[PDB]
Write a protein that binds this DNA or RNA. Structure first.
Lengths: 274, 313
DNA sequence: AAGGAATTTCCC
DNA sequence: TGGGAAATTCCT
């Protein structure tokens, strides 16, 4: 028949899930490689078919037994929670510019779930008793239950492919990593220089200041007590490999979260001689 | 009249975080303007030129321009329906209100909670139409077993419990003290001039919090000023905050400098990147110690002053 | 749209 | 007791 291949995966970490009351529609889901100027959008690529049909963009969970994720995907053509539209003919590459990821309070948890079953939302079909218990609200994998047509005009539902993980950047434990600004960016190649780093919310229990550099790797020394209300870290700089540098070395420093092994954008830092 | 309500002490006006309903059971109380270091103090009131036994009540009132019933309710002690009822009518008429809690209402449960509040007082003998609507100037300690608030008179409390719902200020509240003395047999009919205290402003309120400088980047710099300093602080508002350096002069005199920074320089209401100001006299030859403090442009409230040291170029 | 803050809840 | 963080409604 035909296969589904999502072209613009959803920006891993960027958007912040919104509650109904949160002015509902207040932005969409950015294309994986979106930029401040060049805005992109998640575009699917249904190969093996070129005509009409439908698309039912649903939202499940990030783990194999892909249960349907409780909170709704609102906006353009989004009904009862999911999304259901069509497929352009002279188009074998359709994108979705209009889709917010709304979150469900814990209070409204199981309700949203019943609303998941009362709507017949179950892309891979997982037994009701299985599709229960706990759910990972801070992350989802958009589903694509698109319908094509065999060589006779008969509708055909292909593989419900999943989108790369979408994490509620509002979630402290998986938001994006940013270094707003920093005290100083020079320090001695002997280390020990206290730095004041301002960052986007981080969880003290799970965070580190990572210092790269060809053949050299270390982290700044600090402590829980040194992270201020999740938006600042006062740490001491690490010794450089050469305890008697001869000329400025421009190493890199980025925020590192062990748990998901992710790193912030690198920031210039230059170790100066003794 | 003679016997009234004297507030011999009051809270600290700012410090306590008025807890809500789903925050847990009495995780604290309302202290008082008295640090002491060893012990402490709660809002203590008394009655001067008093009578014999007497029971004083207390209802949370709204700050605003027109004093009326406040949606929030007091909890614990002799409180019930947000109104504490204390006796303390032995020999002395000094009553201390300790371990009192304040429950914050939902930004939605205001109207509904208000309405009822304006009924628990109407029916009862305390603050009738003198804290709701001045059309029910009576129906207080009239002794009525339970006055049936006519579909007409109950609609008065409704209209009041409707307009006042849009004026309400959920972050500030004031304690009202109303004491009633005995009368005929033993019942407490007659009331003494009710007296409102100061505002206690919720702690979980940004524009009222207690300012503090947890720590700063550097605590010294050149008189020339203009040196960058990092400051980590307790929650503040970018638009309403300022760093202020100051010093004491001979006899009369106080120098004053403000840190140069844009609200954009305030990181998540917890940090500020600013530049030091020029010192009084950039001609000094010896280090001069000044004091730095965090201050709110609105209530001109300050913080614990920190010893900043200026030195020669 | 693309964010920063307020005030209730949630716990350590 | 506190009091920080997670939650979640509010407001450009």
């Amino acid at each position: 028949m035909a296969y589904v291949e999502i072209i613009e995966q959803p920006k891993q970490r960027g958007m912040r899930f919104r509650y109904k009351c949160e002015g509902r529609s207040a932005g969409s889901i950015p294309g994986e490689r979106s930029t401040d100027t060049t805005k992109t959008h998640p575009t699917i690529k249904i190969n093996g078919y070129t005509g009409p049909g439908t698309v039912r963009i649903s939202l499940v969970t990030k783990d194999p037994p892909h249960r349907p994720h409780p909170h709704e995907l609102v906006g353009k053509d989004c009904r009862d929670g999911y999304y259901e539209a069509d497929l352009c003919p002279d188009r074998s590459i359709h994108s979705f510019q209009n889709l917010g990821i709304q979150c469900v309070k814990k209070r409204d948890l199981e309700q949203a779930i019943s609303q998941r079953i009362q709507t017949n939302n179950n892309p891979f079909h997982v037994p009701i008793e299985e599709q229960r218990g706990d759910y990972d609200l801070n992350a989802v994998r958009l589903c694509f239950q698109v319908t094509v047509r065999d060589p006779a005009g008969r509708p055909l539902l292909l593989t419900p492919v999943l989108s790369h993980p979408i994490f509620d950047n509002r979630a402290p434990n998986t938001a994006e990593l940013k270094i707003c600004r920093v005290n100083r960016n020079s320090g001695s190649c002997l280390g020990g220089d206290e730095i004041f780093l301002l960052c986007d919310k981080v969880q003290k229990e799970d965070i580190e200041v990572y210092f790269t550099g060809p053949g050299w790797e270390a982290r700044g020394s600090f402590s829980q007590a040194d992270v201020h209300r999740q938006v600042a870290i006062v740490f001491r700089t690490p010794p450089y490999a050469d305890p008697s540098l001869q000329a400025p070395v421009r190493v890199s420093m980025q925020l590192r979260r062990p748990s998901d092994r992710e790193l912030s954008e690198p920031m210039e830092f230059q170790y100066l001689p003794d | 009249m003679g016997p009234y309500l004297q507030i011999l002490e009051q809270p600290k006006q700012r410090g306590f975080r008025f807890r809500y309903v789903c925050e847990g059971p009495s995780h604290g109380g309302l202290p008082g303007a008295s640090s002491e270091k060893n012990k402490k103090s709660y809002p203590q009131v008394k009655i001067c030129n008093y009578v014999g036994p007497a029971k004083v009540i207390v209802q949370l009132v709204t700050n605003g321009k027109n004093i009326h019933l406040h949606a929030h309710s007091l909890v614990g002690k002799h409180c019930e329906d947000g109104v504490c009822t204390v006796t303390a009518g032995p020999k002395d008429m000094v009553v201390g209100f300790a371990n009192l809690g304040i429950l914050h209402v939902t930004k939605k449960k205001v109207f509904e909670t208000l309405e009822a509040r304006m009924t628990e007082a109407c029916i009862r003998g305390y603050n009738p139409g003198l804290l709701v609507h001045s059309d029910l100037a009576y129906l207080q300690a009239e002794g009525g077993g339970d006055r049936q608030l006519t579909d007409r008179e109950k609609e008065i409390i409704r209209q009041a419990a409707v307009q006042q719902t849009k004026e309400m200020d959920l972050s500030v509240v004031r304690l009202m003290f109303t004491a009633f003395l005995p009368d005929s047999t033993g019942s407490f009919t007659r009331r003494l001039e009710p007296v409102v205290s100061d505002a206690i402003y919720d702690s979980k309120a940004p524009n009222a919090s207690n300012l503090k400088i947890v720590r700063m980047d550097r605590t010294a710099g050149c008189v020339t000023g203009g040196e960058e300093i990092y400051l980590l602080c307790d929650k503040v508002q970018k638009d309403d905050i300022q760093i202020r350096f100051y010093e004491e002069e001979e006899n009369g005199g106080v120098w004053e400098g403000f840190g140069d920074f844009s609200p954009t320089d305030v990181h998540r209401q917890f940090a500020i990147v600013f530049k030091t100001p020029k010192y009084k006299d950039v001609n000094i030859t010896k280090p001069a110690s000044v004091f730095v403090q965090l201050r709110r442009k609105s209530d001109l409230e300050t913080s614990e002053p920190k010893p900043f040291l200026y030195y020669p170029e």
